[PDB]
Amino acid sequence: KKGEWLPGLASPGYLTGSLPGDNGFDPLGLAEDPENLKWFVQAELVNGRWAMLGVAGMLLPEVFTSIGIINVPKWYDAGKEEYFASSSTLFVIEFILFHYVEIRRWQDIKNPGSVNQDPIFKQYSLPAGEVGYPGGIFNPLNFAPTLEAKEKEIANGRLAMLAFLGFIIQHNVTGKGPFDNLLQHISDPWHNTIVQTL
Amino acid sequence: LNPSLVISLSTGLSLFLGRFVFFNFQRENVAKQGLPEQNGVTHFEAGDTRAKEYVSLLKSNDPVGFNIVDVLAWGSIGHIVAYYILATSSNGYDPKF
Amino acid sequence: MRDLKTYLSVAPVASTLWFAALAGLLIEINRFFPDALTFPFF
Amino acid sequence: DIAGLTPCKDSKQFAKREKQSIKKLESSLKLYAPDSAPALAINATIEKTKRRFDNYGKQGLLCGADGLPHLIVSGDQRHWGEFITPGILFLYIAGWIGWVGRSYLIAIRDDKKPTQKEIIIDVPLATRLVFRGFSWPIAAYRELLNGELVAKDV
Amino acid sequence: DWMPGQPRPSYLDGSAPGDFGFDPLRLGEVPENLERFKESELIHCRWAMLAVPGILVPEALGLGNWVKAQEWAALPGGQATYLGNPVPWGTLPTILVIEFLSIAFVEHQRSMEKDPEKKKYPGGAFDPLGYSKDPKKFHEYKIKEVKNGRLALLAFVGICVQQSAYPGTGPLENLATHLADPWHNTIGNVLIP
Numbered sequence: 031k032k033g034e035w036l037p038g039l040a041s042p043g044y045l046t047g048s049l050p051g052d053n054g055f056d057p058l059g060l061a062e063d064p065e066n067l068k069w070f071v072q073a074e075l076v077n078g079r080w081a082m083l084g085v086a087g088m089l090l091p092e093v094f095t096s097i098g099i100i101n102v103p104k105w106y107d108a109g110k111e112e113y114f115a116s117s118s119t120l121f122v123i124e125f126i127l128f129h130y131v132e133i134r135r136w137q138d139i140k141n142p143g144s145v146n147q148d149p150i151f152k153q154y155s156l157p158a159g160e161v162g163y164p165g166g167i168f169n170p171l172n173f174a175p176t177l178e179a180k181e182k183e184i185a186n187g188r189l190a191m192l193a194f195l196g197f198i199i200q201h202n203v204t205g206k207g208p209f210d211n212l213l214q215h216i217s218d219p220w221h222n223t224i225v226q227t228l
Numbered sequence: 229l230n231p232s233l234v235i236s237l238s239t240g241l242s243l244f245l246g247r248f249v250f251f252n253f254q255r256e257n258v259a260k261q262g263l264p265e266q267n268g269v270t271h272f273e274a275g276d277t278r279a280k281e282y283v284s285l286l287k288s289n290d291p292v293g294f295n296i297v298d299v300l301a302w303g304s305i306g307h308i309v310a311y312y313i314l315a316t317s318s319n320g321y322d323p324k325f
Numbered sequence: 326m327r328d329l330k331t332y333l334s335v336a337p338v339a340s341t342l343w344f345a346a347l348a349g350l351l352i353e354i355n356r357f358f359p360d361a362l363t364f365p366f367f
Numbered sequence: 368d369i370a371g372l373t374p375c376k377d378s379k380q381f382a383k384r385e386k387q388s389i390k391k392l393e394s395s396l397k398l399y400a401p402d403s404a405p406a407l408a409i410n411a412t413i414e415k416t417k418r419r420f421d422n423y424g425k426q427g428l429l430c431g432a433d434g435l436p437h438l439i440v441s442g443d444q445r446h447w448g449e450f451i452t453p454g455i456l457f458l459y460i461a462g463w464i465g466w467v468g469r470s471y472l473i474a475i476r477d478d479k480k481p482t483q484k485e486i487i488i489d490v491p492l493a494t495r496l497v498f499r500g501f502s503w504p505i506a507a508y509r510e511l512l513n514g515e516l517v518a519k520d521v
Numbered sequence: 522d523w524m525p526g527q528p529r530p531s532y533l534d535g536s537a538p539g540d541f542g543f544d545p546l547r548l549g550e551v552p553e554n555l556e557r558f559k560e561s562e563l564i565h566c567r568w569a570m571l572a573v574p575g576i577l578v579p580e581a582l583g584l585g586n587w588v589k590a591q592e593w594a595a596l597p598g599g600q601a602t603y604l605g606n607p608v609p610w611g612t613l614p615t616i617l618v619i620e621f622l623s624i625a626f627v628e629h630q631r632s633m634e635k636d637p638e639k640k641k642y643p644g645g646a647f648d649p650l651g652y653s654k655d656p657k658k659f660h661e662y663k664i665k666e667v668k669n670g671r672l673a674l675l676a677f678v679g680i681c682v683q684q685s686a687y688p689g690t691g692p693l694e695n696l697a698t699h700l701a702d703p704w705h706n707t708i709g710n711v712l713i714p
């Protein structure tokens with residue numbers, strides 16, 4: 031019993047139950063090949079983490095602004111705002127940095143343990159971890175990376191990926207912010223719904 | 229501007245380069261590339277009566293082997309460069325920068 | 326019964342069902358969204 | 368505008384075409400009692416005509432001297448709705464169909480009589496496989512990388 | 522290793538000067554081509570190491586940038602100026618014939634020698650100070666030349682691409698334009714018009 035996304039339905043044989051978040055869910059057989067399964071485990075990790083941060087930074091500044099504690103533009107209107115650098119400059123910075131980091135992480139995906147040390151400072155390396163869970167400086171509070179911890183990371187990541195999808199599609203149809211949508215719904219739910227939104 | 233000057237300079241420099249500069253390169257390339265051959269054998273050995281090369285004219289008492297054919301080739305180059313610079317000087321052509 | 330489902334699975338019959346469904350679909354789409362040289366939603 | 372064309376919203380010939388079409392249908396309409404069903408049909412064609420020309424004018428189609436839309440397929444971002452976007456949609460659907468059919472052929476190829484399922488469709492298997500086409504680009508990209516897309520030494 | 526985590530090519534053991542294992546297209550798979558590439562790479566590195574200051578220093582002075590310093594030859598009666606001095610032979614056909622004969626002779630002299638190790642590092646008259654003394658220090662100087670020259674090549678690429686992104690500029694003019702407002706003067710504006 032590892033949990034069933036469809037109760038009656040059996041699990042694909044290639045989902046052992048050793049992966050965190052394994053509810054037996056691969057109806058289109060994308061992870062039948064094991065290398066695909068590894069790659070998609072890293073992909074779900076990174077999409078889920080970025081989605082958690084993004085959903086947070088999209089929803090919380092809005093609810094803070096609407097309460098009045100602070101004044102922050104809407105997540106979609108944040109792009110148009112004026113900043114201390116040209117947005118092109120911001121982009122080139124972001125691209126160079128991500129181009130370095132992502133390629134180091136990728137080196138770890140292909141050849142695990144190969145990028146664990148600082149190439150500048152030959153000391154201050156990383157301990158040997160698992161692909162997708164770098165230890166050392168990346169875990170300063172030194173929490174125990176066990177199951178239920180990884181399972182919670184994946185659960186909040188999946189809920190946050192769905193959340194982000196809901197944010198972009200919602201804002202497309204409603205022209206407002208996600209917390210604005212929640213207020214509008216809680217107002218009169220039976221008459222404020224995607225049914226009435228269309 | 230003076231045709232005799234440009235033609236004499238260009239042809240003298242061409243003969244000079246072909247004599248003291250590019251002669252060894254020329255000879256090693258014409259030696260490794262060799263005579264044209266059909267079916268693994270030269271055109272004359274294959275039976276073309278008129279494909280025998282002329283060794284009489286190619287003999288020169290010039291110590292290095294520079295001969296009449298070398299004169300004709302390099303001098304031809306020098307005259308083509310010469311009439312190039314002559315014709316190109318009297319142009320009046322100027323591109324708009 | 327099993328043999329009849331088998332017959333209904335045969336190439337020409339499955340083809341008429343499949344293309345008839347596809348035709349009804351495309352017809353209705355051109356009924357609610359007629360003309361259209363372009364994808365207007367961008 | 369592009370290629371010497373003019374927007375159809377600004378084209379005299381385009382509006383002349385809409386006018387002549389509508390007046391033509393109204394010439395047909397003068398023959399029938401306005402309550403009759405032929406009349407309502409010609410009115411529906413007229414409303415559909417106005418919808419047509421108004422939509423072509425709205426969505427930014429350029430017109431030739433002929434007063435007819437011309438499509439800009441160069442890739443100019445002002446006209447991706449004329450080719451590039453419906454083109455990506457097409458490639459998604461065609462890739463879906465071909466990927467599903469290939470999945471079926473691979474699935475039945477080791478059967479005891481393969482041709483048997485090519486002339487009598489295994490509909491349960493087909494239904495199992497149709498929705499693999501939803502993710503066909505990831506599946507085919509992963510197969511290309513893994514070396515499962517192309518047969519070896521053929 | 523140029524890219525940590527990547528298996529070095531089979532034919533790059535690290536012994537060569539400037540060999541960090543970079544040949545992702547396996548262009549040095551054949552050894553003859555690789556040796557030719559070491560020679561040609563050093564030639565480009567040295568031309569670049571000479572040409573970069575020749576591009577920058579006249580710009581720091583009142584003389585024009587590296588682009589303007591070629592411009593008299595476009596117009597017919599053009600005469601060059603070296604340090605503001607209208608040099609008499611500055612006409613284009615003059616210095617053009619001069620350049621062809623001189624450059625052709627010298628470089629062709631390199632074409633007619635095949636050691637092949639002398640085609641990379643000849644020395645002799647070209648090492649009068651004798652920096653080839655200590656073979657360890659001479660080899661470290663080989664790494665020195667190769668990294669310096671690769672750096673100069675990259676810089677030259679920056680100069681040409683900046684020149685295309687700001688026609689009629691100077692590397693130091695571009696630099697000053699950046700120093701004015703680094704956060705609003707960037708390649709970002711050229712990449713994103």
Ligand code: CLA
Nearest residue numbers: 192193195196199200203204211212214215222223224227
């Ligand atoms: C991530 C979870 C999540 C949550 C709890 C909400 C919540 C809400 N949505 Mg949203 N939405 C989501 C995901 C979510 N949505 C996704 C993934 C999409 C992309 C299709 C959308 C797109 C969407 C649209 C277009 C609209 C809403 C709207 C609404 C509001 C009214 C509900 C409604 O009208 O129909 C709900 C619409 C859906 C598409 C439901 C899909 C959500 C799936 C089924 C996951 C939820 C199941 C989950 C187990 C039950 C709740 C768990 C939760 C507590 C975490 C409401 C506050 C309406 C609105 O904004 O009001 C003006 C509306 O117009 N949503």
Ligand code: CLA
Nearest residue numbers: 537539540541542543544548549558559561562565671674
């Ligand atoms: C034409 C100049 C040139 C030449 C002949 C060489 C030759 C060589 N390099 Mg070098 N290198 C160069 C430029 C050059 N390099 C530059 C500019 C850099 C800085 C990025 C480096 C940095 C470098 C490193 C770190 C290493 C080498 C190595 C090598 C050796 C093995 C690789 C090989 O055989 O590829 C042969 C190369 C060619 C046949 C040239 C191909 C050029 C193609 C056709 C076009 C290139 C387009 C270019 C990207 C344009 C972009 C500019 C702009 C317009 C965007 C070899 C002898 C490896 C080695 O073992 O060192 C000995 C190694 O570790 N190189």
Ligand code: CLA
Nearest residue numbers: 567568570571642643644647648652653662663665666669
């Ligand atoms: C930082 C650049 C650099 C470095 C480290 C080297 C390194 C080396 N070179 Mg090389 N070379 C360079 C640039 C460089 N070179 C340039 C620009 C050229 C001109 C195209 C050459 C052409 C060249 C040849 C033909 C030969 C070498 C040789 C050698 C090797 C032994 C001699 C030596 O160590 O010289 C020591 C170098 C220095 C002490 C650097 C001095 C820098 C000062 C500031 C001079 C710069 C002044 C000015 C800016 C440039 C004008 C000078 C010009 C008029 C000559 C050695 C590995 C010889 C060899 O192969 O040995 C067997 C040899 O045959 N080099």
Ligand SMILES: CC(/C=C/C=C(C)/C=C/[C@@]12O[C@]1(C)C[C@@H](O)CC2(C)C)=C\C=C\C=C(C)\C=C\C=C(C)\C=C\[C@@]12O[C@]1(C)C[C@@H](O)CC2(C)C
Nearest residue numbers: 056057058059077080081084087088105108191192194195
């Ligand atoms: C990365 C992500 C979102 C990241 C958002 C970010 C960074 C937001 C950034 C910013 O907000 C800040 C912070 C500040 C704002 O001012 C500006 C923006 C720019 C807005 C979402 C991923 C979202 C990813 C999603 C939704 C993925 C969904 C995948 C699904 C459902 C797949 C399911 C299946 O594949 C299985 C598992 C098995 C198969 O057999 C069957 C099928 C069904 C195919």
Ligand SMILES: CC1=C(/C=C/C(C)=C/C=C/C(C)=C\C=C/C=C(C)/C=C/C=C(C)/C=C/C2=C(C)CCCC2(C)C)C(C)(C)CCC1
Nearest residue numbers: 239240243299300301302303304305306307308309311312
């Ligand atoms: C004896 C001797 C000597 C001398 C020599 C001499 C003096 C020489 C001469 C030589 C020469 C001096 C030669 C020449 C020339 C050649 C040729 C071969 C030519 C040509 C021409 C041409 C080919 C032309 C063409 C054309 C035409 C016709 C038309 C148009 C224009 C043109 C150009 C195209 C010495 C001392 C050194 C040494 C010892 C011995």
Ligand SMILES: CCCCCCCCCCCCO[C@@H]1O[C@H](CO)[C@@H](O[C@H]2O[C@H](CO)[C@@H](O)[C@H](O)[C@H]2O)[C@H](O)[C@H]1O
Nearest residue numbers: 109110111112113115116117118119121124710713714
């Ligand atoms: C998904 C992972 C990677 C995602 C990468 C996303 C990259 C996004 C690139 C955004 C490009 C920024 O694009 C640039 O934005 C700036 C900032 O508003 C706009 O600039 C605008 O506002 C600035 C504010 O001073 C004015 O100077 C300018 O006149 C005006 O146009 C530029 O006109 C636009 O060219």
